[PDB]
Amino acid sequence: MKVILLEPLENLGDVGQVVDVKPGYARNYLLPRGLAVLATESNLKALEARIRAQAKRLAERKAEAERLKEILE
RNA sequence: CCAGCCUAAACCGUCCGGCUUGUCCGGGCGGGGUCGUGGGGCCCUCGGCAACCGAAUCCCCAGCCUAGCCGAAGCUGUUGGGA
Ligand SMILES: [Mg+2]
Ligand SMILES: [Mg+2]
Ligand SMILES: [Mg+2]
Ligand SMILES: [Mg+2]
Ligand SMILES: [Mg+2]
Ligand SMILES: [Mg+2]
Ligand SMILES: [Mg+2]
Ligand SMILES: [Mg+2]
Ligand SMILES: [Mg+2]
Ligand SMILES: [Mg+2]
Ligand SMILES: [Mg+2]
Ligand SMILES: [Mg+2]
Ligand SMILES: [Mg+2]
Ligand SMILES: [Mg+2]
Ligand SMILES: [Mg+2]
Ligand SMILES: [Mg+2]
Ligand SMILES: [Mg+2]
Ligand SMILES: [Mg+2]
Ligand SMILES: [Mg+2]
Ligand SMILES: [Mg+2]
Ligand SMILES: [Mg+2]
Ligand SMILES: [Mg+2]
Ligand SMILES: [Mg+2]
Ligand SMILES: [Mg+2]
């Protein structure tokens, strides 16, 4: 069972991270407690989004602060 | 006997719901697509088509079905209860 978890669990790993688990642990616990989600191709593709989103957002907030330093120095 | 066809998916637009604004997550609608010389999508170059095909869908008609109608040519005698 592949599931991207939405919470840092000492068991599995950190948020957003994808990891393998026994189906039971997922179907009967992680899933209902919302702690994690199915690594479905649909959701997985949407996870590639948040990465690119903030990979841009950060590589631009900092990218803009590259000119401010380019003048005060 | 005779005959071949429509979609799902990639792709684009829209509507509603969702987030952490992304050619992004889902749902419905429309466009796109449909085959084994493998085909389609998206990009570059040629018509930027009159045309050529065309129904298993509609519309009119013929025909046919459910009543009908026209239709040739004979008389006499005889037996017999009756020709
Ligand atoms: Mg489908
Ligand atoms: Mg598509
Ligand atoms: Mg669109
Ligand atoms: Mg859509
Ligand atoms: Mg709607
Ligand atoms: Mg909305
Ligand atoms: Mg959409
Ligand atoms: Mg469609
Ligand atoms: Mg078509
Ligand atoms: Mg079509
Ligand atoms: Mg084809
Ligand atoms: Mg080219
Ligand atoms: Mg052209
Ligand atoms: Mg052309
Ligand atoms: Mg023209
Ligand atoms: Mg006729
Ligand atoms: Mg007939
Ligand atoms: Mg009749
Ligand atoms: Mg008569
Ligand atoms: Mg008669
Ligand atoms: Mg006599
Ligand atoms: Mg007689
Ligand atoms: Mg007599
Ligand atoms: Mg007689």
Swiss-Prot record:
Q: Where are the transmembrane segments?
A: none
| Recorded GO CC terms | ribonucleoprotein complex; ribosome
Keywords per UniProt: Ribonucleoprotein, Ribosomal protein, RNA-binding, rRNA-binding
Statement: the UniProt record of this protein carries the keyword rRNA-binding: yes
GO BP, sorted A to Z: translation
Tell me the GO molecular function terms: rRNA binding; structural constituent of ribosome
Relate the protein's function as given in its record: Binds to the 23S rRNA.
The family classification in the record reads: Belongs to the bacterial ribosomal protein bL9 family.
Q: What is this protein called?
A: Large ribosomal subunit protein bL9
Q: Which residues of the full protein are shown?
A: 1 to 73 of 148
